[PDB]
Structures are given as C-alpha cells and as structure tokens.
Design a protein around this ligand. Structure first.
Ligand SMILES: CN[C@@H]1[C@H](O)[C@H](NC)[C@H]2O[C@@]3(O)C(=O)C[C@@H](C)O[C@H]3O[C@@H]2[C@H]1O
Ligand SMILES: [K+]
Ligand SMILES: [K+]
Ligand SMILES: [K+]
Ligand SMILES: [K+]
Ligand SMILES: [Mg+2]
Ligand SMILES: [Mg+2]
Ligand SMILES: [Mg+2]
Ligand SMILES: [Mg+2]
Lengths: 96, 131, 163, 63, 85
RNA sequence: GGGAGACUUGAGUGCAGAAGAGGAGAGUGGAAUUCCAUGUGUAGCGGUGAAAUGCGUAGAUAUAUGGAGGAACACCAGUGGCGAAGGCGGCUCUCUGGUCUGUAACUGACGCUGAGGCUCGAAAGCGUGGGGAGCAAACAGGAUUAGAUACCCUGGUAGUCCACGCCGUAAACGAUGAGUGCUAAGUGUUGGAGGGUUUCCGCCCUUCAGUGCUGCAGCAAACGCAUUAAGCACUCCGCCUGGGGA
C-alpha cells in the first residue's frame, strides 16, 4: 500500500459543529473505500497568500492515509472534495 | 561485439607500440600464446609471461625497443579475417618485405612462420604479417 | 642529418611553376621551382624556392634541397623491399626490380630515383600527380626502407637467421 | 554552502514555509541555486515544494 | 510486482536458488508481457511503453530459441506450461 | 565447421539502491491576453522612418470591480535532465517503458548486425466531430514604390488546440549507421559507488555511467577530429562512382 498525505483548506467561517461533521465525513469516505486513515488532524488556521474562492483565511487540515494504488479512496475523496462548499482547496501527495 | 580476438591482439600490440609502452596485457588464448611465442623467438618482442586467473588467463607482452628507442616492430596486419578467411598453398606462402618480416601461418603442423612453412613444404591459414 | 659537403651532388629541376599573388595593381607573378638534388650514390634531397625569375628560383630550390638530404638503402641496383610512400594526395608504390630492368617510374619519381642512384625499380603513382606531393611521397617511402643488417641487429639476429 | 545539505534534511515538506522562504526572493520568485548555493538535486526538490506551497496558498505566486 | 515475480520464479526454477535460466526468465517475461499488453489495450497511444513491450517480446523469443537449440525436451515442457506457440 | 562435454569474462536473471520536462490517462493552479458587465472619467487612442487605414462623444484608451473562454506554462532553468529518433518544461494522482550504480546468488555465449518486413516519426496538409483567447497563410484596407500581386501598418479566414483515423516528409543535422576492444593528459558538470579525514556540514582520494570544454599521439585536401575520434582494429548493414537532363 502507498502512503498519501491529504491537506485541504476549510473555509474560515465554518461553524465548529459543521467542521466536526465535515472532518468526520471525509474520514468515512476514505475508510469506506479501502483506505486506513493513519491520522487526520487540524494543522493551523492561517491567512492565505491570495484570495481563494473569495477567502483570505483558511483552516488547514492534514490527513495521513494509506491504501493500495488501485483503491478508489483517493479518487473518491477528490471527487466529493471538489463538490464540497466548505472545502476551499485540497492536494493529495504521495509521501515516504 | 568482439569478433576477432586475434585482430584485437595485433591491434593492442600496434597501439602500445605506437606510444612505446613498455608492456601490454591481453586475454589469453592458445592462438594468442602461439603468436606471442613466435614474436618472442623471432626477435620482435622482448619477453612474454603468462598469468593464471579465473576467467581465461592473461598474457603479458614486453615490447622491445632498440638504441634510441627505435621500434623493432613497424606494423602488424591481420590477413585472414572472420569475414574473409585467407588460405595459401605451400607454393603460395608469402614473403613479407622480402624476408625482413614474417608471416604467421596456421598449419596442420602447428602455428609457424613463413620460413618454417615453406621448409616443411606446407600451407595453411595466413594469420598475420609482422614487420 | 646528411652533410652536403664532401658529396658531389647533382641538380635536377623537376617542375617550374608560375604562381600568382593578386594585388590591387593587378597580379604579382612569380616562379616556384621544385628541385631534386643527389649524389647518385644513395643520397637524395629535394627543395623548393620562389623568385621573380626562373634562375633565381632554382638557386634557392637547390640550396634548400642540399639542407634536406636523406640516405636511401640500396641492394645492388634496386631497393631492399617494397614500400608505399604517402604524403597528402601523392601515393607512390615502389618495388625491387630485377637487374637491368631500368627505372620503371613516371613523372617526378624518376628524378628522385635517378639522383639517388637507383637503376632498377618498379613503381606506380596511385594518388594525385601534383609534383610537390609525389616527390614528398617518394621520400616518405624511401625513408621507410630498411637494411637487413639494421633489421637483424634490432631483432638480435644474424642476417642469415632473418632471411 | 548548500543550506539543505548542511541542515541534514532529506525530506523537504512543502508545508515548511519557514524553510521555503529563504529560497524565494522579493516578489516571491524562486532563486537560482547558483545564488543560494543549494545543490542540483536539492534545487529540484525545493522547486516542487515551493510550487506545491504556492498552489496551497502557503506562498504567493506574485508579490 | 516483486511478490508475483518471486512466486513465478519459484514455480519455474530449475532447482533451488535458480533465478537465471531460460525457463525462469521466459516465464517471468511471459507475465510481464501479458500485463503490459493489458496496459497497451487501455493506453493505445502509449507508444513509448509499447517499445518496452516489443523489446521484452524479442528477448523472450531469443531465450526460447536458445532453449530449443539447447534442450528440445525442456523447450516443449516449458511452452506447454506457459501456453506459448 | 560439425559432434559430446566443461567454463564465466560477453549477454541476461536475482538481490540492493539512484536520478529523470521518458510515455499514456484523468484532474487541477496562478500570471497574462481577449471579450463581456458595471462604476469612475474625457478626448483622444492606436500606429510609423514618417504617415494613414482603424477604434472613440452611440463615452474610447486608461482605471477599478467582477464574469466567461481558450491557449501557453514566468521564476526555477543549467553545452542541466530524460527518450531510439521525432521529442518531452505549472502542479496532483493512476497506469506504464527505459536507463544508471553496487552485489556476484543464478543461467552458461543465450551474443552483435540485420536485406525483406513491421512499428514509431517535427511542421505543414487531409478526413469526421468539437473548440477557438492569442497568433496568423489566404484575403481586405492603409502605406512604401517607377511598379509591389512584398518587406511596414490596421484588420483577418483556414490553421494553430482537442478526439479519432490518414499522411510519412524536414539543414528528420553531430549534415558523422550499429556493436566491440585498444590508444597521453587537463578541467567543468549530472546520477551513482567506495575509502580517508572532517563534531556534522564539507573536504581529500579511488571509481562507474553520462554530459561539456581544452589538448597530445595518430589521422586529415584543408578546415579540423582527438577515450562522447574523423585515431588504431574486427563484424554486419545502408549508401556513393563527373555536372546537367531528374
Ligand atoms: C592613396 N595612394 C595610393 C596608396 O598609396 C596605395 N597603397 C596603399 C598605392 O598602392 C599602389 O602602390 C599599388 O600597390 C597598386 C596601384 C594600383 O596603386 C598604387 O598606388 C597607390 C597609391 O595611389
Ligand atoms: K470544493
Ligand atoms: K521507473
Ligand atoms: K484539422
Ligand atoms: K566527466
Ligand atoms: Mg617547406
Ligand atoms: Mg500538426
Ligand atoms: Mg529524406
Ligand atoms: Mg567522460
């Protein structure tokens, strides 16, 4: 299995309740698609270097995950992540 | 790939001779040892020593130079080739530079010089001219 | 280095070439002379000279040639063995010939061989026939001729063992 | 001296804005390694890390 | 995959520890060639990878020719197991 | 050369590592151009050697805020990298080829070349279906000019982009076929390996494979080439035999 690091920027105005449901939702997407979420933790709430979907602040949340290259967990995360209004942006990278 | 180890041996001697190297090494073979011996006793090289190794052995040749480091060997030419084998009959045995050089000939009596071959009145495959 | 003195050298004009340098005012025509010099006893040389007149050009050519003498090995009336002289375009094959067969050579090669004292020799010019380069090619071949005694000494053999 | 090699860091996380900041100039452009001293291998890794940082808003594209 | 490769090596090894031999190499090249063909049919514009497939095929052909010229009994045994022609 | 054996150096496999704009697919980022909308604002703007066409009081250009869409990826960036060549430059993931370095467990010459065949092959072009910002054959207008079916200017269609299928040609060039071995040195640089120092960092040396520059021997008509040969050799292929007519 390959190791991926997922970092996505949550809109800075999200409620604490909505964030918790949001974070839970995107762990369940990966768990459901054959991926082991080795960790997932809010990193920081930071000013953005430029406007991103109208926002200049964001809450960066990092997920560390493992899964086979064949599994659809990463693709499924990317699909639902783009549609989501709360998630401004995300990047999925392989890590060692 | 290497298709003519004899021609490789002659060229290694030619190239080392050109820059007047003291010694030269080559992968060993029976025919290469035969040629080295003839160069030894005909006065073209100073010595030849053999090294037993794990692959096929190594033959070390000691090149010969006269007073003022004049080259004893002027050049060496491969005559018979994989692409065109050359055979001479006893009466066709060549003389190289009117006898000042030698031709190394492979015969059923062994690998010998042109002088020896026409003494025994036999031909064979012409390996190389040396002068 | 073969010392010109003590030798009775003879001269042979091989070629006289009229050459032109182009100048603002027209053309500066000169003569370039190629001369072979030799003692007809085994020493031969060649030289070139340029001058506004033929006699002056030949003199310079002769003086140059004497400074560049070489000795040719010689067995009787012919050369010890076959040799191929190559210089630039020139390519000269020279072979020993039987006694009395004469100098079967053409062009400038004849001058070199006759002034060197070779009387019987077969040769063929295989390359360009520009006189300067064939003469140069010839001497390159003659400088490759070897004496049996020198070959035997270098190989640590008697002349009989070699032959 | 190659700053990356000196610090003995073999992984260059693009979240490390502190590290990445010394390898961009004023106006935020990537600096040549001939100006910064970093080696060829580390320069390539830095370039990816910086470019990934820009896309994630940790570094600016311009200004 | 190194796991799939090793298990093919053990299935076809001429003896204990035999990694290099016409049977082992040909068999491993056979699953490599089959997998790369599946990739090829999905990625029909991947001409650069296809060249790797062709070199694999020629190497397999060369090793099969060597096996046939060397031991025709082994050659027939192998091609049956791998289903070659 | 044939036959029966043996061998491990060539070649390949295993194991352990290294780098990469190698390829394919699907997404995605910012800068900029253009268009569009809305404020601000007022007579120019644009362009040339000089001009004019053109655009603008039906409100331009500029400037601000947004929206749409296409194409290309600043810096990094480098006789740097990768690829058989053509070629490949934002980022992310999926699939995938090759190469390089150690090791020396395995095979035991299994190799090289390769007519004919097959595959790939810049750009332009062609077919079907999409797209179309910028650029721009054709073309229009304005100039220049003796004339201008040009160079210059203002526009501008195909095309340039995508999918699929054709085409199969280029100063497709290193104008240098492929394989192998051998033959002074110096100095850069890319990826490795090993050791000697260095608290590390790094420096020192040895080495492999690339990539450059300089330069002997040798070669060359000369120019020049020179361990990345055009040197010294062997193998196989392609090709040449005065110019024109072709
Ligand atoms: C301007 N005076 C010129 C000048 O001196 C020229 N040399 C540079 C000179 O050159 C000459 O002497 C020449 O050599 C040729 C002749 C055509 O003109 C001659 O006269 C030329 C003189 O007329
Ligand atoms: K989103
Ligand atoms: K790879
Ligand atoms: K088209
Ligand atoms: K180097
Ligand atoms: Mg002179
Ligand atoms: Mg095209
Ligand atoms: Mg052509
Ligand atoms: Mg090198």
């Amino acid at each position: 299995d390959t190791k991926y690091e997922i970092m996505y920027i949550i809109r800075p105005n999200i409620d604490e309740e909505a964030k918790t449901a949001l974070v839970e939702r995107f762990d369940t997407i990966l768990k459901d698609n054959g991926a082991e979420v080795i960790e997932s933790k809010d990193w920081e709430k930071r000013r953005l270097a430029y406007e991103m979907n109208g926002f200049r602040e964001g809450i960066y949340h990092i997920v560390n995950v493992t899964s086979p290259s064949t599994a659809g967990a990463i693709n499924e995360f990317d699909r639902l992540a783009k549609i989501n209004d709360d998630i401004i942006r995300h990047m999925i990278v392989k890590v060692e | 790939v290497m298709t003519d180890p004899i021609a490789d041996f002659l060229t290694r001697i030619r190239n080392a001779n050109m820059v007047k190297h003291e010694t030269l090494e080559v992968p060993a073979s029976k025919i290469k040892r035969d040629i080295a011996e003839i160069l030894k006793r005909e006065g073209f090289i100073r010595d030849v020593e053999y090294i037993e190794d794990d692959k096929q052995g190594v033959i070390r040749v000691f090149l010969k130079y006269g007073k003022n480091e004049e080259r004893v060997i002027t050049n060496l030419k491969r005559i018979s080739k994989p692409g065109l084998r050359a055979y001479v009959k006893a009466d066709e045995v060549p003389k190289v530079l009117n006898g000042l050089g030698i031709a190394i000939i492979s015969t059923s009596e062994g690998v010998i010089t042109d002088k020896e071959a026409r003494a025994k009145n036999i031909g064979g495959e012409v390996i190389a001219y040396v002068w | 280095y073969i010392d010109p003195k003590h030798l009775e050298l003879e001269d042979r004009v091989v070629a006289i070439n009229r050459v032109t340098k182009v100048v603002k005012g027209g053309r500066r025509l000169r003569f370039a002379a190629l001369v072979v010099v030799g003692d007809k006893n085994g020493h031969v040389g060649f030289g070139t000279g340029k001058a506004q007149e033929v006699p002056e050009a030949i003199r310079k050519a002769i003086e140059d040639a004497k400074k560049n003498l070489v000795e040719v090995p010689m067995v009787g009336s012919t050369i010890p063995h076959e040799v191929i002289g190559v210089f630039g375009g020139g390519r000269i094959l020279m072979k020993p010939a039987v006694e009395g067969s004469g100098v079967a050579a053409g062009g400038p090669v004849r001058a070199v061989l006759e002034l060197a004292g070779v009387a019987d020799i077969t040769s063929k010019s295989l390359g360009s026939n520009t006189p300067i380069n064939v003469v140069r090619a010839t001497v390159e071949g003659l400088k490759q001729l070897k004496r049996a005694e020198e070959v035997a000494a270098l190989r640590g053999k008697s002349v009989e063992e070699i032959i | 001296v190659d700053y990356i090699a000196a610090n003995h860091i073999e992984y260059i996380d693009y979240k490390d804005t502190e590290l990445l900041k010394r390898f961009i100039s004023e106006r935020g452009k990537i600096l040549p390694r001939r100006v910064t001293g970093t080696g060829a291998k580390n320069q390539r890794k830095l370039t990816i890390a910086i470019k990934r940082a820009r896309i994630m808003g940790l570094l600016p594209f311009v200004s | 995959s190194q796991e799939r490769k090793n298990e093919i090596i053990k299935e076809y090894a001429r003896h204990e520890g035999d990694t290099g031999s016409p049977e082992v190499q040909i068999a491993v090249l056979t699953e490599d060639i089959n997998q790369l063909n599946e990739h090829a049919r999905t990625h029909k514009k991947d001409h650069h990878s296809y060249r790797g497939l062709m070199k694999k095929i020629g190497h397999r052909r060369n090793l099969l020719a060597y096996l046939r010229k060397t031991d025709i009994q082994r050659y027939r045994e192998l091609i049956q197991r791998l289903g070659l022609r």
